[PDB]
Subunit: 431 residues, 4 copies
């Protein structure tokens, strides 16, 4: 089988080790019960993490056979930039978008840590994501995709485990009992692309961003917090974000880190979404992604000045589709690769230019300038009145056909046959 | 022919009379040259219009055989609400949307004024839209659609006319010469759904919202302008917006007028778009639509809590498609009616509920509450760990197929065959 | 729970009783083991069924508390006609289509039999579909959709059951042992809309239609079988198929039965498809649907003469999407209803006319005539050379933008910069 | 201007010279009137053309300054194969498809002949396509795309020309008068990918394929014509068609020529389509494309055995969209390149395998075998009954939401609240 319901005694088990209580207690438990756990910690540039190096040490202290720190920032930022280039975001509300930051983190974490484990001769994976969420499924697909012989063991869904220790307090009393010493209004996941806040009090639709203490930006909704308007420039070269406020970077990680600081000072990008889980039930989250939002705005502004209507519609439609696949843990499936590759090659390749913005609070900003060697937009941009008259006349054929259709629809009752207005009246409950 | 290149002497000609210099001079000229012009003015609830009644009088004074004021507010608001229900908006940049307010105005104006003219035995139409824009084509389609025998005469594209008087000063000197007495950094069109600002200085991408004196809201970008945060509630009943801040209205026109005041105090909805004209060339505009934006945000928030993923994706895809048809002057074509009707019946019908927002400046706002008897979202909402294990296992078949595809793509060079990362590397210029 | 793993002793259990060995043995077993089974047989107009009345009698003989025959033909044909109107078919190969006949049968069977059971105070359902196929899931969704308190019991996935009797021979020896007396190269499912043939020898891609003994048509691939060319006319009225060869019918069931005879004499509609199961693994089937195919061809021919390009594209795109939802057992989900309703109202409503065809063997036929009061097509159908010149000239703006894009793509290596042909060369493995 | 209304005396004019009466008379006339015409003939592998070499000679005899024969077969076949790989076909009726053969011919002809002309210092183009069709616009876009300074001169839309000689007889009397010596039920255009038949008697929907004398295949509808069943194998390697009946070819042109012979003996691929012109009016045509059809069938059969559901849906949707762009003369526009490139790279690259078919008459054939190293389909292809039970159970959340929606739709009147059937009844004219 793929999913082992019980602890594989004596077997080498890889654990995606975050360092929290859940994985610490599970690691200690798996060792105590006879398994040989190996710890793998992903450096994802978590904004509230200042000492990634201490994590593998705690894993060793708790029983890990070996513990490694895998740096995933470069790959994370590369995929985040690809998402920006593809507009691979689908959970939107009134124009505010969730930038699929956790989905991106799992795609890189799931593949890189499993590759690292297979490299160390480890073919069993364990991660603390619960059986009720999206993550459990994302890690599942990316892992089996990377290692065909990968088997999954999640002690948290093992009777023997859940039996004795099953709650937070249960795990804490367990650590104490094992000889080792050692709560918000919501849970937070984060990486350098963004932070998500969900569960607990955020489960209630009457809670709001007001109970959140943002970790990548300021509380822009608090009028007492001072936020000076700020001018910012964002420049792209062939789809690559290369300069912020005229400064370049040694690598994309440093660029994204700076994008985060700029948007962070304003709270740019924060949204509140009710979304659909992979298991077709809804969930609610409050999200942060200051740098992604900054790049996304500049990218789209350039896009509107550089590409034609049909190409921009493909960016939107293929982008939304890709966003859903990314969210489902299918970022590397053939249908996703095809959409991503096509958008990167034909849309992003031409995105060269610079956008100037004035940022104030949250999502309030203004566009101040747009420049590009590739613009198809031109001020006061060729044809005569007579050329237009002919073009207008060529429309008569189709207008006549449409007029006949309206007559036919009125006849069959879809449009009111009695409309002393001139405005066709569609016959449904709303009109 | 349909488009008459020269003035039809002695013939009754209908003129969409706005009251501006252009149509005033044209009316006087057409009468002077032998035609029998009839004036029709549409009451569209233009925000900067306080005396619609005086317009037909000026038409009479300038030579109109008869002049009528056609009230189009009810139809305008009805179509605007339908657009909200259908998310019929397509020009977006970073989540900021143009609400197709001029397109909606033309659809109602073009049909209603032509119906009024045909009613008075008038079968020739003239309107001052230039031969370089979208409007000329919108009025053309809606008119011929409403009156099969409609012929078009636009003096502004008549040699005899353009010859003598051809400029603004030319027309002004013409009025004076005819015995009658009588400039911004951009041109403005507006109706009660919104205001558009384009041309002149706005043709330059280095101009911005800063040179605009908004007519439906405040200058939220001016830090010296004081804008108190404000809580607002918006309630829908079966897709119909029925209450604002707990108050109902005698009709939808009054509701929209109030929505405008609420969003106006904050500058909600304002955007800057580079878009594609019907003639496939780009144009730039700065837009206002405070009430539409307010309703749009609340509607979408409810939508995310009430409908499933596939239904919401149809709202987005069909909505964007509909927005483009609306923009092209095809709001009543069969393909548009089908999308609009389907969305009104199956999506809007279930949109019942109330959304509470906190508005600050421009597009900076927060969602404070979302309630609905039709929510499918439920706090802490059924299945066991074992149920999930089986569901996860059912994925293996497709994961194996995908793994084989990745192998095949690496083999054919689409993915790097040499990737010591674990993260598949797509082979294109961006990666 | 929803799915009962073990027999609910003493409880009333509803069984979708087909009369085959599987359900006969299961019914006898469930009674013998203490449950109180009720039998429900759906009359679906199975082509190879001549005595539906005897089925409930055999159920009574085997232990059914009560047995009913539910006529589902009218609903089946109504849904089949809706599918035709919506082009709700998605498994196609070289233009040959699977008409989703089993999916349609399950939607009507699953809802109607469950309603019948709930009517008799029965709230547990059992059906013999295996745990490896699509059907098990289709019946599951339609049942719970119709009865919220419905619980599922499938003895075939019950250890106690599978234990003792688990094979065909096991069940046969069981009947004998219980006091009652009593194999092709593939399995067949069928209803009056079509017949499916799959499994066994058809699992192999080197098998073909040659091993199939069609039950709704002749062996058109056998040159020794004589098939006279035949002229046939098909007439629709507002989307409803009303006449075949000039004759009308007392109801749609009789019309479909005649459509089947006409197409059957030729083998019209037969296809061989490799498709994707709901569980994302592939399956292979050989299908028959002579009447559906006949109506589908005539409907589409009229569609091409009556509706415009955008409307026809929506028919194809929304139709394919709907076909997939139908196949998944989601024919009544909101996203499906929206697509189906929109197509029926705006596309089908205008389909009035008659198509004449000459049928020969299999899918070889010719179109001989197409007539319709609603045609927008007209022989030698308005504009001048000068009108076209202007229209062509209006294209220059976009052509220039496209030329600049080609230059940009060549520059970035997507198109060959070295092409002494004039034909742009896309840079990928295929060119 | 771009389109010259009158003959540019003394100027070098390039003429796409087919050799027919129309271009022969125009060439002679343009020389006689003072222009300096250059002739360019495209070798497109026209099936009914046995002496392409004589064409430029006749051009020289009629006054051409120089005349060249440009071989376009290789490029034509390359683009035709790309279309097959992308399923770039959109005019379909009952599964029968028009393979966009003229659109492909114009894309190669328009670009290659203009490049040849610009090469000879010729910057004015003339072609005999009428102002009422699609071709005039296709040649227009491909030409200006290839040569920015290209100007168009079509004598057929020149008053001076149309004045004196305007009809066929007029042109014939003209040739005689100039010292040179020298009708079906429809017009035919053709190249090695296919033949189109339209106009004249085919304008009437009561005409049929029976009045057509096919030029690429036999009259399969004539029962007296003997057509022996034939087995054929088609093999692809990474999307490239490489073998037919086990034989390979020196180049793709020879392969396509053989594909044509094979399908031609049976009349495979012939269809009758009512379609929409670029100018939104309908037209009718009868088409031949035996080789394209043969490759298309084999390609799709392999596609169904190799790619997953989402990837196949993209092939269909993106393919149909691409087909429309191709038809409009936009085969090289950015939105087309993006769709074509994505499909070639991610779908076609994996199409390796062989399909065996039995061809009889017209579109009647059977699939006999399908093999591929890349198949994801496998006979008797992993999961247990318990795994399926859990997977089925995970559906309850969404089923409950859907049940609530049905209740809501019944409440708002979209579904009958009174349905003693169990089958939800959609409330519209069709049900
Ligand atoms: N930086 C990291 N390195 C390695 N593994 C990690 C890292 N961050 C998270 N994980 C793994 O992912 C699991 C889930 O993450 P986390 O506990 O933060 O999520 P959550 O908010 O509880 O949501 P869910 O349970 O749905 O995943 C952790 O138990 C751990 O196995
Ligand atoms: N309220 C109205 N009632 C009747 N006709 C109107 C009204 N508003 C505008 N029109 C008609 O529409 C024409 C175009 O409107 P307007 O002059 O405001 O547009 P514009 O900004 O110049 O842009 P364009 O020229 O592209 O339309 C006017 O010349 C007039 O004929
Ligand atoms: N006419 C009918 N009336 C009632 N129930 C039926 C009828 N036809 C089929 N069924 C039910 O559907 C079940 C599955 O049908 P059948 O055995 O014909 O399918 P199959 O070819 O074995 O494929 P699968 O197992 O995937 O359904 C039967 O066991 C029976 O419960
Ligand atoms: N092989 C060729 N080489 C060069 N030019 C060609 C060739 N075939 C066709 N053309 C050009 O295309 C024009 C149109 O082709 P043709 O006359 O065959 O089309 P048609 O059936 O009359 O339809 P339409 O007028 O709509 O193009 C010809 O007048 C000629 O200029």
């Amino acid at each position: 089988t793929t999913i082992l319901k019980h602890l594989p005694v004596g077997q080498r088990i890889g654990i995606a080790f975050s360092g929290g209580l859940d994985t610490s207690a599970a690691l200690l438990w798996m060792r105590q019960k006879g398994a040989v756990p190996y710890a793998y910690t992903a450096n994802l540039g978590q904004p509230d993490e200042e000492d990634y190096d201490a994590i593998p040490r705690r894993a060793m202290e708790y029983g890990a056979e070996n513990a490694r720190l895998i740096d995933c920032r470069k790959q994370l930022v590369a995929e985040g930039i690809a998402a920006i280039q593809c507009g691979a975001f689908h959970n939107t509300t009134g124009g505010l978008t969730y930038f699929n930051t956790t989905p991106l983190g799992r795609a890189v974490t799931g593949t890189m840590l499993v590759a690292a484990m297979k490299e160390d001769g480890v073919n069993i994976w364990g991660d603390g994501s619960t059986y009720k969420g999206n993550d459990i499924e994302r890690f599942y697909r990316y892992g089996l995709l990377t290692n065909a012989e990968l088997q999954i063991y999640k002690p948290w869904l093992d009777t023997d485990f859940i039996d004795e220790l099953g709650g937070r307090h249960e795990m804490s009393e367990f650590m104490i009992a094992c000889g080792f010493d050692y709560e918000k209004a919501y849970s937070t996941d984060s990486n350098m692309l963004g932070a998500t806040h969900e569960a607990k009090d955020l489960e209630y639709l009457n809670s709001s961003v007001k109970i959140v203490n943002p970790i990548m930006g300021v509380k822009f909704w608090d009028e007492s917090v001072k936020i000076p308007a700020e001018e910012v420039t964002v420049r792209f070269e062939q789809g690559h974000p290369v300069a912020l406020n005229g400064k370049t970077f040694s690598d994309d990680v440093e660029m994204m880190l700076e994008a985060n600081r700029i948007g962070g000072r304003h709270g740019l990008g924060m949204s509140d979404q009710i979304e659909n889980r992979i298991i077709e039930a809804k969930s609610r989250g409050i999200y942060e992604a200051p740098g992604m939002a900054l790049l996304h705005i500049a990218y789209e502004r350039l896009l509107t000045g550089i590409h034609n209507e049909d190409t921009i519609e493909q960016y939107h439609a293929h982008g939304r589709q890709l966003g859903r696949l990314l969210y489902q843990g299918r970022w590397f499936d053939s249908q996703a690769l095809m959409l991503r590759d096509s958008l990167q090659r034909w849309v992003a390749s031409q995105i060269t230019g610079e956008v100037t913005l004035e940022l104030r609070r949250g999502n309030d900003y203004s566009i101040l300038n747009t420049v590009s060697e590739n613009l198809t937009y031109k001020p006061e941009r060729v044809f005569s009145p007579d050329d237009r008259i002919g073009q207008l006349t060529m429309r008569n054929l189709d207008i006549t056909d449409t007029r006949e259709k309206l007559f036919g629809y009125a006849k069959t009752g879809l449009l009111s046959s009695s409309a002393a207005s001139g405005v066709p009246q569609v016959e449904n409950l709303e009109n």
